[PDB]
Every structure is written in C-alpha cells, then in structure tokens.
Amino acid sequence: LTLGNTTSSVILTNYMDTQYYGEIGIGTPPQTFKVVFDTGSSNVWVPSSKCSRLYTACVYHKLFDASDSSSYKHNGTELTLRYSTGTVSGFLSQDIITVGGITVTQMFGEVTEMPALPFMLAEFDGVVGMGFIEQAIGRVTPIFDNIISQGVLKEDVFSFYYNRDSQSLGGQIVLGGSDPQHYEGNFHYINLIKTGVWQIQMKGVSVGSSTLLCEDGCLALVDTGASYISGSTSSIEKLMEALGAKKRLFDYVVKCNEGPTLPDISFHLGGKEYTLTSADYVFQESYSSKKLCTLAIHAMDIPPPTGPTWALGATFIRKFYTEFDRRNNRIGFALAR
Ligand SMILES: Cc1ccc(S(=O)(=O)N[C@H]2CNC[C@@H](C(=O)NCC3c4ccccc4Oc4ccccc43)C2)cc1
Numbered sequence: 001l002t003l004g005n006t007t008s009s010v011i012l013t014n015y016m017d018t019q020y021y022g023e024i025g026i027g028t029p030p031q032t033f034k035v036v037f038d039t040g041s042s043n044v045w046v047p048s049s050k051c052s053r054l055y056t057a058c059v060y061h062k063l064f065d066a067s068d069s070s071s072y073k074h075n076g077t078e079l080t081l082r083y084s085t086g087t088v089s090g091f092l093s094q095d096i097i098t099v100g101g102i103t104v105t106q107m108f109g110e111v112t113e114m115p116a117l118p119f120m121l122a123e124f125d126g127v128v129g130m131g132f133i134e135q136a137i138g139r140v141t142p143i144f145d146n147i148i149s150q151g152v153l154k155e156d157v158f159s160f161y162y163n164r165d166s167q168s169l170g171g172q173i174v175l176g177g178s179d180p181q182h183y184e185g186n187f188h189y190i191n192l193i194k195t196g197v198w199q200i201q202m203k204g205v206s207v208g209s210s211t212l213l214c215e216d217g218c219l220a221l222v223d224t225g226a227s228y229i230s231g232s233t234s235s236i237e238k239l240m241e242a243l244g245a246k247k248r249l250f251d252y253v254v255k256c257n258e259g260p261t262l263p264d265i266s267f268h269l270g271g272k273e274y275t276l277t278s279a280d281y282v283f284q285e286s287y288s289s290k291k292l293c294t295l296a297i298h299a300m301d302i303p304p305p306t307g308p309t310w311a312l313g314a315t316f317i318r319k320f321y322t323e324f325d326r327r328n329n330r331i332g333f334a335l336a337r
C-alpha cells in the first residue's frame with residue numbers, strides 16, 4: 001500500500017432525492033457516462049453498443065462502443081449482476097476510466113441485456129461499485145482498489161455527501177479524504193463486522209422514545225446505491241404499523257396532512273443515536289388531507305450472505321455525511337452541512 005497527497009472529488013447530480021450520479025469517461029477518446037457510485041456492490045458496468053435495440057432501456061441510455069476506443073482491451077467473459085430492483089447481463093471489457101481527474105485501467109462489464117423495468121426509470125447509464133473484491137462478480141478488481149494501487153491518494157478513504165433536492169450541488173464524492181465544508185462536528189466511527197462488506201452492527205431501532213425494533217441487535221449495510229432506508233418485510237411491517245402507514249405495491253404512504261406529525265426514527269450505531277425526523281423521511285409533496293405522501297423507507301429482503309439486513313441509503317446519507325475507511329475497516333458519520 002502506497003499513499004500520496006491527492007484528494008479528488010466527483011460532483012453528483014441529485015435526481016428527485018432518489019438518484020445521485022456523477023460522470024466517468026471510458027476509452028480513448030473518452031465516452032462519458034452518468035454513473036451511480038454504489039457501496040453495496042463492487043462491479044463497474046455501463047450499457048453496451050452490442051445491446052440489442054429491442055431492449056428499450058438501451059435506446060434511452062448512453063452506450064459504450066469499443067470500436068471507437070483505441071485503449072480498449074477485449075476480455076469477453078460473461079457476467080450477470082443482480083440488484084434489488086432488477087438484473088443486468090453482458091460481458092467483461094477493459095479500458096481506461098477517468099473519475100474525478102484520476103485515470104485508471106479498469107475491467108468493467110458491457111451490458112447487453114438491460115430490462116425496461118427498472119432501467120427506463122434510471123437517469124444514470126451505469127454503476128460504479130464502491131464495495132470490496134469479496135462482493136465482485138467474476139472476482140474483478142474494483143475501481144477503488146485500482147486507484148489505491150496507484151499510490152496517489154492522501155488516505156485509503158472515500159466520502160459521501162448527498163444534498164436535499166433543489167440549482168445547487170446535488171452531492172459530492174471525495175476520493176482520498178473528506179470535505180469539511182459538507183459536515184460539522186466530528187466523525188464517530190463504527191468498525192465493520194468483517195472486511196469484504198460495508199456492513200456494521202446496529203444495536204436497535206426506535207420509533208419515538210421506545211426501542212421498538214432490533215432490540216437483540218441486527219445488521220446495517222451502509223449503501224450509497226440504495227435510495228431509501230430498508231429493513232426486512234417483517235421489520236418494515238412493525239415500523240409502519242407504529243407510524244400509521246398503509247402498504248401499497250412498491251411503497252408505504254401516509255395522508256399528506258399527517259406527514260409532519262410522524263415520530264422520529266432513531267438508529268443505534270456505535271455509541272450514538274442517529275435520528276431522523278419526519279422531514280428527513282417523508283416526501284412532503286403537499287399538506288392535503290386528500291393526498292397520499294410516500295415515505296423514504298421501504299421493505300427489502302436482502303438475500304444471504306449479506307442479508308437479512310437493514311440498508312442505510314440516501315435517506316440516511318442526506319442527514320449524515322459518510323466516510324468509508326478502507327485502511328481501518330470502518331465507517332464514519334458526521335452531521336451533514
Ligand atoms: C435481489 C437482491 C436484493 C438486494 C441486493 S443488495 O445486496 O442490497 N444490492 C444493492 C446494492 N446497492 C444498490 C441496490 C439497488 O438496486 N438500488 C437501486 C438503484 C440501482 C443501484 C445500482 C444498480 C442498479 C440499480 O437499479 C436502479 C434502477 C432505477 C433506479 C434506481 C436504481 C442493490 C442484491 C440482490
């Protein structure tokens with residue numbers, strides 16, 4: 001392991017408080033893609049020019065053309081990548097990737113099968129996995145491991161800032177450090193249960209003053225690629241009953257006029273309570289008694305080995321600026337500015 005002095009940053013675009021994406025350049029000359037930086041996965045993928053136009057998601061997204069890149073190195077190995085909302089498949093390729101002004105030779109997936117549900121809803125083209133090699137499909141070296149290998153970064157850390165929707169900064173990723181302009185106070189660290197996954201121990205979930213859930217302890221995946229806070233179907237049913245929310249097909253809702261009256265939700269992580277008020281978890285679209293307002297908390301049954309687990313996504317990161325520490329296998333949280 002080599003350390004330099006360089007800190008690099010990627011400006012993110014906030015789409016509806018659900019999608020935070022930045023830009024990467026792939027190839028020579030660079031082909032630009034809108035990408036989500038996901039701590040819950042470890043593969044890099046973008047849609048391929050080899051994607052059949054009968055996949056409508058491929059008509060609506062930027063496609064990587066290897067035939068236009070002079071730095072491209074063929075691989076051809078087939079791979080399937082499974083997410084919570086859907087699945088993508090294609091093959092592996094190698095090329096130069098630029099992310100925050102850091103140029104790295106990276107093995108990535110060229111997606112040839114991209115389903116309209118959910119990919120037509122995606123403002124981003126692809127994904128940049130910020131997880132560990134242990135989660136990488138095809139044991140492909142992740143981009144952050146390749147960036148560490150260069151020995152340019154001041155520290156083996158990366159930090160996430162997700163803003164509240166607005167013509168301001170959507171968010172920001174710092175490679176090799178943190179940005180003090182985006183947090184206040186000091187970081188409180190929670191060690192990873194084990195290397196290989198950005199997952200920490202959770203000591204309890206409170207609805208108001210009472211610790212209703214996770215009383216005997218549970219898991220919390222700190223996931224930048226997840227839009228919401230998620231728990232198991234069972235945990236979410238208890239949580240929603242306590243809030244007074246109604247289950248719909250894809251989400252939970254409350255009558256808009258009752259959004260501001262909902263109790264605080266607290267997450268016990270390390271030696272601290274991480275509290276979200278209703279303003280932090282309700283999509284307060286109106287105050288009308290004749291309208292339904294969505295919550296930024298969903299049921300998600302994450303399969304083993306990673307799951308059953310809670311996932312602390314954009315809902316959580318908006319309130320708490322997050323530092324992912326590779327050198328010490330820990331996650332730091334500080335109050336976001
Ligand atoms: C079945 C299954 C459940 C859960 C998981 S997991 O371990 O929790 N994986 C997570 C890792 N972080 C991102 C999660 C996710 O899909 N977020 C949703 C987000 C996304 C992020 C990355 C890739 C694809 C992807 O699809 C869309 C499409 C439209 C809008 C938003 C997204 C899945 C894997 C597989």
Ligand SMILES: *[C@@H]1O[C@H](CO)[C@@H](O)[C@H](O)[C@H]1NC(C)=O
Pocket residue numbers: 074075076077092107139140141
């Ligand atoms: C594809 O890449 C892997 C490394 O990730 C390598 O071991 C393998 O030999 C490559 N295959 C081809 C056909 O180049």
